[PDB]
Amino acid sequence: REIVCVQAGQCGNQIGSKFWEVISDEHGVDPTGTYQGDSDLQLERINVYFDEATGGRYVPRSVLIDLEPGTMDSVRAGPYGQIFRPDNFIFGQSGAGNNWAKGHYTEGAELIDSVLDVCCKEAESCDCLQGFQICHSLGGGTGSGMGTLLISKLREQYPDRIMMTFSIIPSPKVSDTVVEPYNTTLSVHQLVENSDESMCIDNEALYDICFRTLKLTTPTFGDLNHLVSAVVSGVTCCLRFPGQLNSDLRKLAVNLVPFPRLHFFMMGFAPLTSRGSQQYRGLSVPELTQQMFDAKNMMQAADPRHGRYLTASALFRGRMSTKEVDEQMLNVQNKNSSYFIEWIPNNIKSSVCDIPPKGLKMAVTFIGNNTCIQEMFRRVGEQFTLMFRRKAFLHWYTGEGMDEMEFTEAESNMNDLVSEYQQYQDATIE
Amino acid sequence: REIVCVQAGQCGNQIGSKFWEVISDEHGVDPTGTYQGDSDLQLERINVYFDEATGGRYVPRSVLIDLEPGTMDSVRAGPYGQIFRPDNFIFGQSGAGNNWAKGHYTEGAELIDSVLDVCCKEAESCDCLQGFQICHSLGGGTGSGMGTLLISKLREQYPDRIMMTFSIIPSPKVSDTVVEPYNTTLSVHQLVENSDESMCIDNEALYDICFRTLKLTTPTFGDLNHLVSAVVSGVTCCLRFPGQLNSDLRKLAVNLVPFPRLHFFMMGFAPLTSRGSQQYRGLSVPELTQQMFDAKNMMQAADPRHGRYLTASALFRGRMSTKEVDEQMLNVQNKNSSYFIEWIPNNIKSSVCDIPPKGLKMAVTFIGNNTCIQEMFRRVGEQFTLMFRRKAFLHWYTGEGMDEMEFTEAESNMNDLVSEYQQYQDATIE
Amino acid sequence: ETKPMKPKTSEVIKMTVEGSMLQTTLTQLTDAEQTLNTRVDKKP
Amino acid sequence: REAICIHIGQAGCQVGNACWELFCLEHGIQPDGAMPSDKTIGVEDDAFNTFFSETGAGKHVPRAVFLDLEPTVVDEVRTGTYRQLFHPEQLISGKEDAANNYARGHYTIGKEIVDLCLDRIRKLADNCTGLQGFLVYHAVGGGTGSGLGALLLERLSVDYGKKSKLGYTVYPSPQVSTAVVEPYNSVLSTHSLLEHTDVAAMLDNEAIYDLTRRNLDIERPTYTNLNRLIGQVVSSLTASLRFDGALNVDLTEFQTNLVPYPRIHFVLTSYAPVISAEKAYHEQLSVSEISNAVFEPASMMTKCDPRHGKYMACCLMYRGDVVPKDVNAAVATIKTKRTIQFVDWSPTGFKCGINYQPPTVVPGGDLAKVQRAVCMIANSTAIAEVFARIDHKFDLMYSKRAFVHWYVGEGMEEGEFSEAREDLAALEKDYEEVGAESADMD
Amino acid sequence: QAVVKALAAQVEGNKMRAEQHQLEVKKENEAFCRAVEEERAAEAQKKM
Ligand SMILES: Nc1nc2c(ncn2[C@@H]2O[C@H](COP(=O)(O)OP(=O)(O)OP(=O)(O)O)[C@@H](O)[C@H]2O)c(=O)[nH]1
Ligand SMILES: Nc1nc2c(ncn2[C@@H]2O[C@H](COP(=O)(O)OP(=O)(O)O)[C@@H](O)[C@H]2O)c(=O)[nH]1
Ligand SMILES: Nc1nc2c(ncn2[C@@H]2O[C@H](COP(=O)(O)OP(=O)(O)O)[C@@H](O)[C@H]2O)c(=O)[nH]1
Ligand SMILES: [Mg+2]
């Protein structure tokens, strides 16, 4: 049961580089590709993410795509860059220009056939294929446009598999680019139709995690990408190690999504705490659950206290009792009963895995489906409608060929998504 | 049955530092936090004040709050400061300005949510919670305003638990600040509604203890805080060790307070004696009772000879006979019968604990409910009325936002408290 | 082609939760505990 | 005398591991299947035959299959400690799970795996003298256990016909829960189980957690403890087939005595001397105290209180050195109690069994070693409360179609939900009607 | 006599495993303390 990864744009390639560092460390693969591990548990599921090349070697199931090769040359120059198969690198000759329409219609259609040829070459090699995993930002240009193009083609070609995306979205507090609202709105329009499950992270939340919890004096993008690589490698942990209560991406989707449009989730990871402070508080299942539900540990600007939990899932790694897990989930559901949607008798799924990440005694990853996400879409919509009424910078997109009707359609579809979340929020049973 | 301590302001943090030194010594905790004791009797109730952190360590269940970090940095720098959990230190970025209104309304509401979050995190971790214990001065700025704010919020959230306070009140003679009457009047108004039991200490009484009883040539605040830490650790001693006649904070409160407004008490501790004199007088139960009732040894400026005892309590530590305790309390009640309220047939509760404070063969702590406490409030109220008629310094408080009507309400409520005590002083059977 | 699964050793099985307490029954015993079970058929 | 064991899904395979650990240690088979020569007494009665078959070189192999849709648990069994005990053909594994969907197990995926399973079951059943039942272990809360368990029981019931099928079933606990979609799977499971099972034993994990906290002194129990208790119960019930005794009880005697009408086959189970070794020296353990113990609701392994209902039949299994006169005195004392009530149409409420083989002690185990034990399975109207609680949660979710699109996409008509809910309503009415007294007074 | 012998043997074995578990926990705590002391040396890197 093997996953294929796709990394698109600068953010995607950087997050991918840190992810493949974390996974290669976890399975004991040398940066030359030679297996040097020290337990059979590392070897026995290596197939899930690596293909085996001849006399020792392992190759990582990933496709790298970008519109200007500067980043790709940077990734090839990195410490693990040599591991990647050369034929898997796809790049063009001119940039996206921060324009969704260029990335989707002009340079997208120019490159897209070579990416589908490579993904099919990678997919047809699997003995049984599980879902794809894609990392990209929604505020950029080639990431948003070509990522959603590729997602649509893969959904046409593989409708029975899983399509999973992790996505970084522009913060209202601090933009790096002026035209972010257009790219975000069009990308959310593509995702709500195409995706099966999508996780959203705010860079502002990663900065607040680093400063308040880790107390880093001078954080860098490497730290943010380390938090992301930690969660990405955590969601898949039950795929590749034994445990007392196995779980799977499809089983998570079936338990988390009540209706097919409601597939946007908040993410958190609980035992983040510096090793020096860790001496002041011992690890235990109650301790993990309390940090796990603390809004300090959630990776989105919206706060749960303004919404209600529809569903939640917990994946535990480590040697622990099932009784303690079950009774903790009962006590949290009973004591905080106003924040849980009442027509479901138990909103939390649990899962337990035997093998923790190296150097931690225990860890949990949290996925939450909460109506307070309506906030991210509403904030973007105000900024978009502000821009669209004045036809702001619009000539760039229309000159590529877009009809103005696409913008009003995408706005209407996002507004209906906000309305569907808002109706279920209604705290009053009425 | 575990107590959570709160220390507020400079006085509170300093008293807390000396208290946690005495308690850590009594339970044999090294300044690194490791248990190094030599009898199981030390270990078997350590849970009452400490939580266990991973790999051996214990952490003390205390919250430290202050508005400017100078004091907090001083306590962290002290010899035991490292034991305290870093996250339990709460501080702002601008001072209370020695002003009650700032501490209650402007910086109070800014910080209070983080203090309530920490107190709830600490409280909800206990398997069964006994009352909270709070130490602060009323003459300061953040101590009075934010302490009474926090007491009101905790009384809203946990109305079935116990609320216990130790409180320092401004000397009529040794003032450090001109606007002391306002801070005292508003704080006593808050306490009489919120508190379950409140102990009052005059700094003048600690000076008279040091100079007259201990004959110290050059006393310092460390001695005053040692006397306070001795009584504070003594009231709870029966909670945490075995004995022939167990006692508890709730049993003291139920036996001392006849009616719910009458909850202000005097304190004393008996085996105080100078190192030169100590060679001249052995410990015995008559000696402890005689020192215990001597007004020289009482920690308030009001003298019992000007009032009447409603109720009294005695907590004895050490291996001693019950016969001597019972016969001493009968003999003292019979010989001084005019100073005891006649419609209660026996005013004194006794309790006996096997384990004395380190380096003493025997000790007793005294809690007294005496109407002469009314004299402190009346003297403070006269000076407040003197200042208010001339609207002294009033623009600071009105500029913060206070209605003048709060001052007349607080004055009326304090005056009614004085009247109620005076009425019970002069009550008769008829 | 699917490579056949390789058998585990003693310390590898001990890592998990089920296998550790299976091996506890199998190996970690005193001499007296192996005498506990016996057959009493046709005796009474 | 033979029995075939079928283990399906995760709970069923892990409970199988605990069961076969116990059956090995009780018979004396080593993990490699080689019976040792020093365990001999000159003659060796064929007591293993209920659970083992011989090749001819003297290796033992057990009459069981392990069925799963995900590989991890069965490859763990294949690579574990008992690798040489099981035949590799017996360990059957698919490619992908039923994803907590009963519909996925039953319609899309289980039809592919079911024919291999039936061929293996055929391969077991042709090599016996006379098969006298199937033992099945599963949970009704998960997708493959529900869907493939139903499909397999339907096919077994057509192919083998009248032959008995006995199920041990882990039902969803009344407030502990592990997945959101448990009510749909449990309702549809109970719907299939009504037609195609001869006796169904109901278990709740919350009760075994309460029993292990209260009686044993275990602060942090895990599934291996619960599975060891279940294995002990199964060993007690099947001991009557395998060892000498005063009053034997064949598996057909259970069905004849416990089931008054053909739908009323769901029974409660409890076990008496759950006791620690340190606890074991504080108490005598005579017949009458443990008989009094099995009737207290603190002893039950299902979360129902029988004081809120009426007993229809009781079956009491005593094993070890016990004498019939003490069993009779105990049963007469139970009958005297006022908080124990039998339906007036069932005057002779008890069946007794007495076996000489004492319960086995497992080296790592947490139960003490004891000379005698009693185990009970009993039919009572209190069971009606468990279905009502499952039905309320089903009604809550289905009123708004909270998750139905997964099930409808996987090949299922929307109508099947309403059919199952009406069948469980009719089962509730059956338990209401059977407990109604008939009056014939002028 | 047989039953009392069996119970005594079981109690002794329980004591043995309890002692072994305590020894393992003590070793783990010592290793944790050493590893905490090791990470303090990263304070010199910031200084230099
Ligand atoms: N007693 C006991 N119950 C278990 C065990 N494992 C899971 N359960 C319970 O069974 C239900 C979950 O069923 P599963 O066995 O995990 O479902 P499954 O057979 O694996 O089906 P899939 O998830 O599709 O593979 C829950 O109620 C769990 O509490 C176990 O080892 N022992
Ligand atoms: N977390 C993270 N965010 C990034 C990184 N690089 C860029 N971003 C963010 O992604 C957005 C810019 O998108 P970009 O990747 O340049 O789009 P592209 O030009 O199409 O590749 C901004 O919000 C950046 O803050 C990175 O390495 N990590
Ligand atoms: N008894 C005693 N009194 C103190 C101590 N520290 C300060 N005080 C008194 O408390 C008053 C000052 O209040 P302070 O604690 O500074 O208020 P804050 O600024 O809000 O913390 C003065 O009357 C001081 O004499 C102490 O350690 N012991
Ligand atoms: Mg499963």
Tab-separated table of N, CA and C in Angstrom, chain A residues 1 44-45 127-130 161 238-239 241-248 250-251 253-260 311-312 320-324 326-327 329-330 334 342-350 424, chain D residues 10 14 68 70-73 75-76 79 95-97 99-101 104 175-183 205-206 209-210 213 218-224 393 396-397 399-407:
chain	number	residue	atom	x	y	z
A	1	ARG	N	0.824	-1.202	0.000
A	1	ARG	CA	0.000	0.000	0.000
A	1	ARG	C	0.862	1.257	0.000
A	44	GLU	N	10.737	-3.521	6.972
A	44	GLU	CA	9.581	-4.305	6.541
A	44	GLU	C	8.454	-3.506	5.875
A	45	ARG	N	8.436	-2.174	5.947
A	45	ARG	CA	7.438	-1.415	5.193
A	45	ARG	C	8.059	-0.333	4.319
A	127	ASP	N	2.378	-2.188	-7.085
A	127	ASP	CA	1.575	-3.409	-7.141
A	127	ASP	C	0.125	-3.183	-6.723
A	128	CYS	N	-0.112	-2.314	-5.744
A	128	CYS	CA	-1.436	-1.767	-5.483
A	128	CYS	C	-1.274	-0.327	-5.030
A	129	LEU	N	-1.966	0.597	-5.684
A	129	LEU	CA	-1.734	2.012	-5.450
A	129	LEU	C	-2.744	2.544	-4.447
A	130	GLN	N	-2.237	3.202	-3.410
A	130	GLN	CA	-3.034	3.966	-2.471
A	130	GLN	C	-3.031	5.418	-2.981
A	161	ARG	N	-9.039	6.053	-6.372
A	161	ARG	CA	-7.993	6.240	-5.379
A	161	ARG	C	-8.319	7.420	-4.476
A	238	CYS	N	0.430	4.893	10.889
A	238	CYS	CA	-0.291	3.621	10.938
A	238	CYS	C	-0.205	2.790	9.658
A	239	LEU	N	0.084	3.398	8.507
A	239	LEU	CA	0.318	2.609	7.296
A	239	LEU	C	1.526	1.687	7.394
A	241	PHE	N	3.643	0.697	10.358
A	241	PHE	CA	4.120	0.012	11.547
A	241	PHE	C	2.959	-0.729	12.196
A	242	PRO	N	3.244	-1.771	12.975
A	242	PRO	CA	2.184	-2.508	13.670
A	242	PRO	C	1.576	-1.697	14.803
A	243	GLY	N	0.422	-2.159	15.271
A	243	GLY	CA	-0.243	-1.462	16.357
A	243	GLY	C	-1.441	-2.235	16.857
A	244	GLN	N	-1.944	-1.785	18.009
A	244	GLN	CA	-3.104	-2.395	18.644
A	244	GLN	C	-4.424	-2.013	18.003
A	245	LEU	N	-4.477	-0.911	17.261
A	245	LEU	CA	-5.734	-0.493	16.645
A	245	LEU	C	-5.374	0.258	15.362
A	246	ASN	N	-5.231	-0.500	14.279
A	246	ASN	CA	-4.743	0.037	13.020
A	246	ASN	C	-5.712	1.062	12.440
A	247	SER	N	-5.165	1.953	11.620
A	247	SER	CA	-5.954	2.991	10.975
A	247	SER	C	-5.358	3.271	9.604
A	248	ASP	N	-6.125	3.976	8.781
A	248	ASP	CA	-5.803	4.135	7.373
A	248	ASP	C	-6.408	5.443	6.888
A	250	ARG	N	-8.144	6.112	4.275
A	250	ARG	CA	-9.537	5.926	3.894
A	250	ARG	C	-10.438	5.813	5.114
A	251	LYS	N	-9.958	5.155	6.166
A	251	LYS	CA	-10.734	5.035	7.394
A	251	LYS	C	-10.883	6.374	8.109
A	253	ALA	N	-10.894	9.315	6.439
A	253	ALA	CA	-11.853	10.063	5.629
A	253	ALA	C	-13.286	9.625	5.901
A	254	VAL	N	-13.521	8.315	5.973
A	254	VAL	CA	-14.865	7.803	6.223
A	254	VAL	C	-15.396	8.255	7.577
A	255	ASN	N	-14.537	8.308	8.596
A	255	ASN	CA	-15.020	8.773	9.894
A	255	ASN	C	-15.077	10.289	10.071
A	256	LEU	N	-14.320	11.066	9.304
A	256	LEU	CA	-14.282	12.513	9.500
A	256	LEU	C	-15.278	13.317	8.675
A	257	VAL	N	-15.618	12.885	7.465
A	257	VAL	CA	-16.384	13.704	6.527
A	257	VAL	C	-17.849	13.271	6.564
A	258	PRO	N	-18.759	14.097	7.102
A	258	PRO	CA	-20.184	13.744	7.116
A	258	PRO	C	-20.847	13.925	5.760
A	259	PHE	N	-20.452	14.966	5.033
A	259	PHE	CA	-20.995	15.273	3.719
A	259	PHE	C	-19.862	15.755	2.829
A	260	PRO	N	-19.926	15.463	1.526
A	260	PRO	CA	-18.701	15.452	0.712
A	260	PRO	C	-18.043	16.808	0.533
A	311	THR	N	-16.429	16.603	14.181
A	311	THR	CA	-15.733	15.333	14.333
A	311	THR	C	-14.280	15.613	14.679
A	312	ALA	N	-13.624	14.609	15.252
A	312	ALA	CA	-12.194	14.688	15.498
A	312	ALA	C	-11.601	13.294	15.409
A	320	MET	N	1.145	2.202	25.140
A	320	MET	CA	0.192	2.815	26.050
A	320	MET	C	-1.041	1.931	26.172
A	321	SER	N	-1.812	2.159	27.235
A	321	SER	CA	-3.029	1.392	27.461
A	321	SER	C	-4.184	1.933	26.631
A	322	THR	N	-5.030	1.024	26.140
A	322	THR	CA	-6.242	1.435	25.439
A	322	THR	C	-7.296	2.005	26.381
A	323	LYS	N	-7.350	1.496	27.613
A	323	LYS	CA	-8.279	2.008	28.616
A	323	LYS	C	-8.077	3.493	28.872
A	324	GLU	N	-6.822	3.910	29.038
A	324	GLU	CA	-6.525	5.313	29.287
A	324	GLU	C	-6.940	6.199	28.118
A	326	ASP	N	-9.405	5.537	25.871
A	326	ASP	CA	-10.863	5.564	25.818
A	326	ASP	C	-11.446	6.447	26.915
A	327	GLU	N	-10.957	6.292	28.145
A	327	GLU	CA	-11.476	7.100	29.237
A	327	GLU	C	-11.106	8.573	29.108
A	329	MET	N	-10.894	10.171	26.168
A	329	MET	CA	-11.822	10.704	25.171
A	329	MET	C	-13.240	10.832	25.716
A	330	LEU	N	-13.638	9.931	26.614
A	330	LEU	CA	-14.929	10.087	27.274
A	330	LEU	C	-14.950	11.300	28.192
A	334	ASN	N	-17.436	14.517	27.751
A	334	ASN	CA	-18.437	14.820	28.774
A	334	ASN	C	-18.247	16.184	29.434
A	342	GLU	N	-24.247	17.872	18.709
A	342	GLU	CA	-25.066	17.005	19.543
A	342	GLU	C	-25.759	15.856	18.813
A	343	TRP	N	-25.956	15.911	17.495
A	343	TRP	CA	-26.633	14.784	16.865
A	343	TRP	C	-25.682	13.655	16.501
A	344	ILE	N	-24.433	13.715	16.945
A	344	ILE	CA	-23.514	12.590	16.869
A	344	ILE	C	-23.131	12.183	18.287
A	345	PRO	N	-23.324	10.923	18.683
A	345	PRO	CA	-23.127	10.559	20.089
A	345	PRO	C	-21.671	10.516	20.505
A	346	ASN	N	-20.742	10.324	19.573
A	346	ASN	CA	-19.325	10.375	19.911
A	346	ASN	C	-18.591	10.860	18.674
A	347	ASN	N	-17.893	11.976	18.828
A	347	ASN	CA	-17.312	12.724	17.730
A	347	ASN	C	-15.858	12.361	17.467
A	348	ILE	N	-15.187	11.708	18.412
A	348	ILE	CA	-13.753	11.466	18.341
A	348	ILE	C	-13.506	10.011	17.978
A	349	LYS	N	-12.670	9.795	16.970
A	349	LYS	CA	-12.057	8.503	16.698
A	349	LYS	C	-10.638	8.465	17.257
A	350	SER	N	-10.266	7.330	17.845
A	350	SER	CA	-8.913	7.092	18.323
A	350	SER	C	-8.222	5.988	17.533
A	424	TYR	N	-24.440	24.860	9.862
A	424	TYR	CA	-24.130	23.858	10.877
A	424	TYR	C	-23.514	24.455	12.137
D	10	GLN	N	-9.646	-7.981	13.212
D	10	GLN	CA	-8.558	-7.619	14.117
D	10	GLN	C	-8.805	-8.170	15.510
D	14	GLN	N	-6.715	-11.334	17.240
D	14	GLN	CA	-6.034	-11.151	18.522
D	14	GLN	C	-6.634	-12.019	19.633
D	68	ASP	N	-8.571	-11.840	7.482
D	68	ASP	CA	-8.480	-10.391	7.553
D	68	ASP	C	-8.379	-9.802	6.155
D	70	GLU	N	-6.932	-6.488	5.855
D	70	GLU	CA	-5.620	-5.853	5.908
D	70	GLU	C	-4.547	-6.886	6.237
D	71	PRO	N	-3.355	-6.729	5.666
D	71	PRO	CA	-2.297	-7.718	5.903
D	71	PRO	C	-1.687	-7.679	7.293
D	72	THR	N	-1.614	-6.516	7.942
D	72	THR	CA	-0.695	-6.328	9.065
D	72	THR	C	-0.910	-7.344	10.190
D	73	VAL	N	-2.156	-7.579	10.590
D	73	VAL	CA	-2.335	-8.482	11.720
D	73	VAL	C	-2.013	-9.936	11.367
D	75	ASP	N	0.055	-11.040	8.819
D	75	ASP	CA	1.497	-11.231	8.627
D	75	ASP	C	2.241	-11.171	9.958
D	76	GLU	N	1.735	-10.393	10.922
D	76	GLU	CA	2.289	-10.454	12.269
D	76	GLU	C	2.124	-11.841	12.879
D	79	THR	N	4.674	-14.146	11.103
D	79	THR	CA	6.052	-13.831	11.439
D	79	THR	C	6.304	-13.837	12.951
D	95	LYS	N	-6.021	-7.536	0.255
D	95	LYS	CA	-5.212	-6.378	-0.113
D	95	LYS	C	-5.567	-5.114	0.663
D	96	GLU	N	-6.855	-4.838	0.880
D	96	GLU	CA	-7.262	-3.558	1.443
D	96	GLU	C	-8.496	-3.736	2.314
D	97	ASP	N	-8.614	-2.865	3.313
D	97	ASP	CA	-9.586	-3.009	4.383
D	97	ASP	C	-10.985	-2.606	3.914
D	99	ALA	N	-12.650	-0.393	5.572
D	99	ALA	CA	-12.729	1.047	5.835
D	99	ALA	C	-13.930	1.426	6.705
D	100	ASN	N	-14.199	0.608	7.722
D	100	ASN	CA	-15.345	0.750	8.622
D	100	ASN	C	-16.683	0.752	7.902
D	101	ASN	N	-16.750	0.282	6.665
D	101	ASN	CA	-18.015	0.215	5.952
D	101	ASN	C	-18.445	-1.240	5.912
D	104	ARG	N	-18.846	-1.941	2.290
D	104	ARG	CA	-17.608	-2.252	1.587
D	104	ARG	C	-17.207	-3.708	1.785
D	175	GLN	N	-21.217	3.525	26.442
D	175	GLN	CA	-20.669	4.873	26.320
D	175	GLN	C	-19.207	4.935	25.905
D	176	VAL	N	-18.388	3.919	26.165
D	176	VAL	CA	-17.100	3.836	25.490
D	176	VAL	C	-17.350	3.524	24.022
D	177	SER	N	-16.665	4.247	23.142
D	177	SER	CA	-16.808	4.052	21.709
D	177	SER	C	-15.480	4.351	21.037
D	178	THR	N	-15.272	3.746	19.878
D	178	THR	CA	-14.011	3.832	19.162
D	178	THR	C	-14.147	4.466	17.785
D	179	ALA	N	-15.313	4.376	17.156
D	179	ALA	CA	-15.518	4.976	15.850
D	179	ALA	C	-16.923	5.554	15.772
D	180	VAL	N	-17.078	6.531	14.885
D	180	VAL	CA	-18.341	7.248	14.765
D	180	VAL	C	-19.430	6.359	14.176
D	181	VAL	N	-19.086	5.519	13.201
D	181	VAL	CA	-20.101	4.808	12.427
D	181	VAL	C	-20.523	3.478	13.044
D	182	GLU	N	-20.117	3.224	14.288
D	182	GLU	CA	-20.473	1.976	14.971
D	182	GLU	C	-21.960	1.611	14.963
D	183	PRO	N	-22.916	2.531	15.177
D	183	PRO	CA	-24.331	2.116	15.178
D	183	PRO	C	-24.827	1.486	13.887
D	205	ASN	N	-16.825	-4.260	26.081
D	205	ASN	CA	-15.493	-3.977	26.595
D	205	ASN	C	-15.519	-3.145	27.872
D	206	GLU	N	-16.495	-2.240	28.000
D	206	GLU	CA	-16.632	-1.418	29.202
D	206	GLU	C	-16.870	-2.242	30.462
D	209	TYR	N	-13.460	-3.902	31.323
D	209	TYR	CA	-12.643	-2.871	31.966
D	209	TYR	C	-13.055	-2.615	33.411
D	210	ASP	N	-14.358	-2.482	33.668
D	210	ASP	CA	-14.817	-2.311	35.046
D	210	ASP	C	-14.449	-3.499	35.929
D	213	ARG	N	-10.682	-3.422	36.660
D	213	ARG	CA	-10.356	-2.410	37.663
D	213	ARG	C	-10.845	-2.776	39.062
D	218	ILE	N	-5.560	-3.887	38.533
D	218	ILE	CA	-4.840	-3.436	37.349
D	218	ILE	C	-5.264	-2.007	37.047
D	219	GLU	N	-4.303	-1.087	37.087
D	219	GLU	CA	-4.588	0.316	36.822
D	219	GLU	C	-4.712	0.625	35.336
D	220	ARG	N	-3.993	-0.098	34.479
D	220	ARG	CA	-3.896	0.232	33.056
D	220	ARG	C	-4.046	-1.015	32.197
D	221	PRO	N	-5.242	-1.594	32.148
D	221	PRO	CA	-5.436	-2.813	31.363
D	221	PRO	C	-5.382	-2.527	29.871
D	222	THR	N	-5.097	-3.581	29.111
D	222	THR	CA	-5.074	-3.528	27.658
D	222	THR	C	-5.722	-4.788	27.107
D	223	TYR	N	-5.940	-4.790	25.787
D	223	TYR	CA	-6.763	-5.811	25.140
D	223	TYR	C	-6.318	-7.241	25.420
D	224	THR	N	-5.024	-7.473	25.631
D	224	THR	CA	-4.560	-8.812	25.987
D	224	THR	C	-5.178	-9.352	27.275
D	393	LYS	N	-29.290	5.795	19.094
D	393	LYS	CA	-28.182	6.424	18.374
D	393	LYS	C	-28.304	6.265	16.861
D	396	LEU	N	-30.933	8.792	15.804
D	396	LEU	CA	-30.332	10.123	15.802
D	396	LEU	C	-29.530	10.400	14.535
D	397	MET	N	-28.622	9.497	14.156
D	397	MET	CA	-27.854	9.767	12.938
D	397	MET	C	-28.680	9.670	11.656
D	399	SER	N	-31.921	10.096	10.954
D	399	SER	CA	-32.882	11.167	10.699
D	399	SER	C	-32.353	12.272	9.792
D	400	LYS	N	-31.042	12.497	9.769
D	400	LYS	CA	-30.453	13.499	8.885
D	400	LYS	C	-29.513	12.927	7.827
D	401	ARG	N	-29.497	11.609	7.651
D	401	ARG	CA	-28.621	10.907	6.710
D	401	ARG	C	-27.140	11.245	6.881
D	402	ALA	N	-26.687	11.243	8.138
D	402	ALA	CA	-25.435	11.901	8.510
D	402	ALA	C	-24.236	11.378	7.719
D	403	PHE	N	-24.188	10.071	7.431
D	403	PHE	CA	-23.048	9.476	6.735
D	403	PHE	C	-23.436	8.579	5.564
D	404	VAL	N	-24.721	8.516	5.216
D	404	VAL	CA	-25.268	7.449	4.380
D	404	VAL	C	-24.628	7.375	2.996
D	405	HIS	N	-24.161	8.503	2.452
D	405	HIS	CA	-23.597	8.514	1.102
D	405	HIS	C	-22.430	7.554	0.893
D	406	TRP	N	-21.613	7.289	1.913
D	406	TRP	CA	-20.591	6.252	1.764
D	406	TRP	C	-21.216	4.887	1.504
D	407	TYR	N	-22.191	4.512	2.327
D	407	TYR	CA	-22.860	3.223	2.203
D	407	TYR	C	-23.648	3.103	0.901
